[PDB]
Design a binder for this molecule. Sequence first.
Ligand SMILES: NS(=O)(=O)c1ccc(O)c(NC(=O)NCc2ccncc2)c1
Ligand SMILES: [Zn+2]
Length: 257
Amino acid sequence: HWGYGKHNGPEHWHKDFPIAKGERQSPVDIDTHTAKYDPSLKPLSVSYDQATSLRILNNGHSFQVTFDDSQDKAVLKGGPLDGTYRLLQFHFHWGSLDGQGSEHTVDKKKYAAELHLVHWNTKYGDVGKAVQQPDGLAVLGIFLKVGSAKPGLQKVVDVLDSIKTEGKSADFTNFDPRGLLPESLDYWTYPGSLTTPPLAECVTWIVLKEPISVSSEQVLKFRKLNFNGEGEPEELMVDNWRPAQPLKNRQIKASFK
Ligand SMILES: NS(=O)(=O)c1ccc(O)c(NC(=O)NCc2ccncc2)c1
Ligand SMILES: [Zn+2]
């Protein structure tokens, strides 16, 4: 029912998900001058060495690669996290044009896309219990800009033709998530929400300072995807991003001076 068009887009979501006007909603603009360097933060430790990708799926608002999370195979720990968070999926948000597409903004600058890597707190047992917890989820957000091609993205790009419309999935084994990470792991962090319905306020956002670059041909193939399912009017999947929400009583902390 909810979507990203004029009639079902982010400005209507509060009618079905009243938490959309809550206190810790996401995304936000990261004012880099008002973020506080916090030395009490630990380095991010990404242990994706034994990650097990399963499928890629068009869910009708994005495409999503899923992982086997029944074991500590790909985990995130450190940073502002307490405990161990298992990788569950990643997905992308992107625009119709290269000057918009990201959900988070940095000094009001929008990037061409955003990669979201979704992890959940193992102490809660499964992901459906974690999403009801104030600290149940950790999302690692990575900006994409348009420049040179990114090799570790090309395997995703090559299969997009197989999942063009909503509900299609394809096998997607032996994918390495480390190929999507920038060279530096400097980050901002703040407590937030999911950026799509149901917009649960369960996320510790970790947003990386350094973007990854992708080529225009690579992003062009993202925009060839469809919101609709097969046998329907053709709606290209673009501008699947929520606009920035007020920070309200929240401080953004930085891991880097
Ligand atoms: N962009 S995000 O903050 O990293 C993010 C991370 C994990 C998520 O699960 C979502 N949200 C969904 O996956 N919503 C599907 C759904 C829609 C309506 N009813 C039930 C389920 C957003
Ligand atoms: Zn997302």
